[PDB]
Amino acid sequence: NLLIDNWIPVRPRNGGKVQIINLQSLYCSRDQWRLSLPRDDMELAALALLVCIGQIIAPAKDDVEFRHRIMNPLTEDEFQQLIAPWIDMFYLNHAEHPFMQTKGVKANDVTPMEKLLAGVSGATNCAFVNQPGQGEALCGGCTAIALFNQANQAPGFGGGFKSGLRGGTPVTTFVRGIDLRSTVLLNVLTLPRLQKQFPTENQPTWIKPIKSNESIPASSIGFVRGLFWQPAHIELCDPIGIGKCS
DNA sequence: CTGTTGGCAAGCCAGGATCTGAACAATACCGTCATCGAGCACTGCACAGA
């Protein structure tokens, strides 16, 4: 679960070794973190995920509170309160509503993980210029990040596959902070602006599925359904045991 | 064996005009994204029974 267990790849703001923390450790400490992945595009995909998460779990009621939470980390009790009604929507492996997935996908073959690795494959020259086996075994964090990247920044897999709400390959622009905690909070719209931004079906595509060949008025989409939009029918396979993430 | 020297080298004036210098037609195409499943091929597989 993205709200509970460790999955966030960080290292100290000016420190060294990578450690995998959880959302609570990020929101409830004056520790300075910065995202750390081998790819800048995945670091951005991760931040986008974090921001979209913090957008639904803790919009400030006003600018006064907005400035307060930035300078002051929440307490673990406040955090648990806020994440409580959302735990149900952030499960990777889940019975009826897997995170950004769709149970019951009819496919003759199993798609390799490289197809979510945005650029490792996609062109006829990729197999010649890129290193093989980058997607043989992806950890939980990278998998979610990759899924979120495909739905937002990357183009569709091919014919019959749709792209995100902003279209194919949009430019994402976030306000930069001093550390990871501040940056995430800095990009969360306060409740008033949130209402002015979105004046609907406010349930995800993996809980309230999209109907085939249906026409959807853009105004009929809730902000959480849109932020976590999944234009593609994707279903993860059963994972494997302990080892290095490729 | 022995072969020279001085003194001197110009000035005037004059070089053109006419009129003319192009047009047409034509400049390419292919491949270097991907997806899915189906319909239809090499291609070995032993055999059973010939």
Swiss-Prot record:
Coiled coil: none annotated. Induction: Repressed by H-NS, activated by LeuO. Activated by the BaeSR two-component regulatory system, possibly due to envelope stress. Part of the casABCDE-ygbT-ygbF operon. Disruption phenotype: Loss of resistance to bacteriophage lambda infection, loss of plasmid silencing. Belongs to the CRISPR associated protein CasA/Cse1 family. Type I-E/Ecoli subfamily. Part of the Cascade ribonucleoprotein complex, with stoichiometry CasA(1),CasB(2),CasC(6),CasD(1),CasE(1)-crRNA(1). Interacts directly with the 5' end of crRNA, CasB, CasD and CasE. Binding of target ssRNA or dsDNA causes a conformational change in the Cascade complex; CasA is required for high affinity target DNA binding. Interacts with Cas3 once Cascade has recognized target DNA. CRISPR (clustered regularly interspaced short palindromic repeat), is an adaptive immune system that provides protection against mobile genetic elements (viruses, transposable elements and conjugative plasmids). CRISPR clusters contain sequences complementary to antecedent mobile elements and target invading nucleic acids. CRISPR clusters are transcribed and processed into CRISPR RNA (crRNA). A component of Cascade, which participates in CRISPR interference, the third stage of CRISPR immunity. Cascade binds both crRNA and in a sequence-specific manner negatively supercoiled dsDNA target. This leads to the formation of an R-loop in which the crRNA binds the target DNA, displacing the noncomplementary strand. Cas3 is recruited to Cascade, probably via interactions with CasA, nicks target DNA and then unwinds and cleaves the target, leading to DNA degradation and invader neutralization. This is CRISPR system Cascade subunit CasA. It comes from Escherichia coli (strain K12).
